[PDB]
């Protein structure tokens, strides 16, 4: 049985960065050759595994996370980068064996009005711990006032939309990201090639 690589790389919607949709591929022959078929991956950028060898290796599970970040930020979803996206929204660990893959999903996620359903977290008190997932609506203040959750001086809604719109340049265009990781534990490996 082959691993279900088709509902991960094709879906009609992808998780927005604040909710980053992790998933688990387990107990299946996985040939990472099913892909390399449709993604002119801007940045396949695999780290440490390289393409041919993983056809060969076997591991306990493969974790595939999916997000939608605009083009200028695709650099940040990598190891060792700092910025709004990798510090308040998704943090890759310092050490990694995985392949970020991004394709310009201009056609599906672009609304001429804007697609206000894709959003990112502008402000958080501390940088996210590696692979942390954080989902909340809580007001961020600058003053000491609790502010009672209203839109006012020193009171703001932390998520903000990407405002994706077609007449926008390459920098501001949806770029779906799939961060495949390789988890190996002392338990017997079940995801071979």
């Amino acid at each position, epitope marked *: 049985n082959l691993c279900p690589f088709d509902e991960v790389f094709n879906a009609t919607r992808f998780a927005s960065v604040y909710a980053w949709n992790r998933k688990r591929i387990s107990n299946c022959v996985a040939d990472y050759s099913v892909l390399y078929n449709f993604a002119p991956f801007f940045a396949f950028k695999c780290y440490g595994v390289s393409p041919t060898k993983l056809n060969d290796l076997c591991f306990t599970n493969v974790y595939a996370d999916s997000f939608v970040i605009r083009g200028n930020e695709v650099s940040q979803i990598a190891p060792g980068q700092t910025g709004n996206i990798a510090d308040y929204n998704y943090k890759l660990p310092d050490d990694f064996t995985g392949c970020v893959i991004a394709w310009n999903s201009n056609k599906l996620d672009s609304k001429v009005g804007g697609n206000y359903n894709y959003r990112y977290r502008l402000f958080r008190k501390s940088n996210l711990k590696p692979f942390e997932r954080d989902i909340s609506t809580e007001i961020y203040q*600058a003053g000491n006032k609790p502010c009672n959750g209203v839109a006012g001086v020193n009171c703001y809604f932390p998520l903000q939309s990407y405002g994706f719109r077609p007449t926008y340049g390459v920098g501001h265009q949806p770029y779906r990201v799939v961060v495949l990781s390789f988890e190996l534990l002392h338990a017997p490996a079940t995801v071979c090639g």
Partner: antibody, heavy 117, light 107 residues
């Protein structure tokens, strides 16, 4: 009132180390985006350094490794430790809080640095 | 970004309609702020995002733009409007300001 007395610095020999201090009225320094612009006399303002709400530091090309930024929770006082100075750093330095997208600002009156021999 | 402001000596009489044009080298979308620096006194923020004038400003200054070329407008030139205006882009890490357009009054 967001009024800033970012007043530190007056001048040193070339190769010295000065220490700026900023200050803060309605907000806390460690919770809001802040940065330090640099206005040379008679020239367009240039951007030196910037801090984030979680400690991320970004610098300018001309100040890579000579300048440092540092944020002080105890007394506001966004600190900028100028090190490895030179004879072309003479400029007026303004403390600045930038809320990123929703729009408000503080640019404090700013302090003069004339570092010479 | 190679920010470019085209008018540097522009002089209009009392109560006139003038316009400032800041131009960029890439798509900065709408993230370009307009500043106003009076002589000696610290700069003020006039139009954040290129399309939103901050509250409390008088209501004459309007700006609109997208992608590379941006424009700044002055609706009523009151005598107490002499300053130097700057355009800043705040989302590309090498934040580069513009040259300034020193405005003066004629009589």
């Amino acid at each position: 009132e967001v009024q800033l007395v970012e007043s530190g610095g007056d001048l040193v020999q070339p190769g010295g180390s000065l220490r700026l201090s900023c200050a803060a009225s309605g907000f806390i320094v460690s919770r809001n985006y802040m940065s330090w612009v640099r206005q040379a006399p008679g020239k367009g303002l240039e951007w030196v350094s910037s801090i984030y709400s979680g400690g991320s530091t970004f610098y300018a090309g001309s100040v890579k490794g000579r300048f440092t930024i540092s944020r002080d929770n105890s007394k506001n006082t966004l600190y900028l430790q100028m090190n490895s100075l030179r004879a072309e750093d003479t400029a007026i330095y303004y403390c600045a809080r930038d809320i990123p997208r929703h729009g408000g600002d503080s640019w404090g009156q700013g302090t003069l640095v004339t570092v010479s021999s | 970004i190679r920010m470019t402001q085209s008018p540097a000596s522009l002089s209009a009489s009392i109560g006139d309609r003038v316009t400032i044009t800041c131009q960029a080298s890439q798509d900065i979308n709408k993230y370009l702020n307009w500043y106003q620096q009076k002589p000696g006194k610290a700069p003020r923020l006039l139009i954040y995002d290129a399309s939103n004038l901050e509250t409390g400003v008088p209501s004459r200054f309007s700006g609109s733009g997208s992608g590379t070329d941006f424009t700044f407008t002055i609706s009523s030139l009151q005598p107490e409007d002499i300053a130097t205006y700057y355009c800043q882009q705040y989302d590309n890490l090498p934040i580069t300001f513009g040259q300034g357009t020193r405005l003066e009054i004629k009589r």
